[PDB]
C-alpha cells in the first residue's frame, strides 16, 4: 500500500513564490515515480501542469515548475496570481498503478 502526502492547504499572496510538496510513505520519491501535477478549478476542471516529474505540460504557464527536492517532489509557483487559487493534485507511479495525493488547497489573497 502506498499513501501520498500533500499539505492540506497553504496561503500566499500575489508576486510571492510558493512550493507544494508531494511525498511518499514507502520512501524517497524518485524519477521512477514520474510525478504528475494537476490543478483543480471550480466546476471540476482539471488541467495538467507538470509531467514526468518535471515537464511543463504543453499549456501550463511558465510560472509553474516541477522537480524533486530532497526525498520528495515539489511544485513551485514563482510569482503567484489570484487565479492560481485552486486545489493542486499529484500522482505517484508505483510501477504498475498511480497513487493520488489528497490535494493542497491554495488560497491566493
Amino acid at each position: 500500500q502506498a499513501v501520498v502526502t500533500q499539505e492540506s492547504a497553504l496561503t500566499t499572496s500575489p508576486g510571492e513564490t510558493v512550493t507544494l510538496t508531494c511525498r511518499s510513505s514507502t520512501g524517497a520519491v524518485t524519477t521512477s515515480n514520474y510525478a504528475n501535477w494537476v490543478q483543480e478549478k471550480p466546476d471540476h476542471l482539471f488541467t495538467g501542469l507538470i509531467g514526468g516529474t518535471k515537464h511543463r505540460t504543453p499549456g501550463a504557464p511558465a510560472r509553474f515548475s516541477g522537480s524533486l527536492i530532497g526525498d520528495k517532489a515539489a511544485l513551485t509557483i514563482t510569482g503567484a496570481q489570484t487565479e492560481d487559487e485552486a486545489i493542486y493534485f499529484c500522482a505517484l507511479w508505483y510501477s504498475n498503478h498511480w497513487v493520488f495525493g489528497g490535494g493542497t488547497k491554495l488560497t491566493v489573497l
Binding site: 504528475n36 471540476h44 482539471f46 495538467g48 509531467g51 505540460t57 504543453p58 498511480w98 490535494g103
Partner: protein
C-alpha cells in the same frame, strides 16, 4: 490541440452496471496510455485503471474484478466497464491521456 471527452450514461441503478466511453482525438491511441480516474462527490481522486499504448491494461487491484478498459483504435475510443453497481460509485469519471497529462471534462454518474 489534444481533446478527450467522457460520453457516459446518466444515472444507473444499483445492481445494474455502467459503461463509459472516452473519445480521444488529436493523436493515435497506440502511442500513449489512457487512465480512468474517478472522483467521488466531495472526495479524493482515484485511479481505476490504465491501458498501455500497446493494449496491456493494469487495474486498481481492489477494483480488479469489476473493470475492463479496452479500445477501438479505428473508432478512436477507449472504453471502461464496472459491474455490480453500488452507491459509493456515484462519482465523476474521467479518462487521462499519458505523457501529458491531458484530462477529460468528466461526466457525473449517479447511482437510484
Amino acid at each position: 490541440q489534444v481533446q478527450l471527452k467522457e460520453s457516459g450514461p446518466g444515472l444507473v441503478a444499483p445492481s445494474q452496471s455502467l459503461s463509459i466511453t472516452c473519445t480521444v482525438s488529436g493523436f493515435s491511441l497506440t502511442g500513449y496510455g489512457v487512465n480512468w480516474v474517478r472522483q467521488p462527490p466531495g472526495k479524493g481522486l482515484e485511479w481505476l485503471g490504465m491501458i498501455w499504448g500497446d493494449g496491456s491494461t493494469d487495474y486498481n487491484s481492489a477494483l480488479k474484478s469489476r473493470l475492463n478498459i479496452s479500445k477501438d483504435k479505428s473508432k478512436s475510443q477507449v472504453f471502461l466497464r464496472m459491474y455490480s453497481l453500488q452507491t459509493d460509485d456515484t462519482a465523476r469519471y474521467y479518462c487521462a491521456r499519458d505523457y501529458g497529462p491531458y484530462w477529460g471534462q468528466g461526466t457525473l454518474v449517479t447511482v437510484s
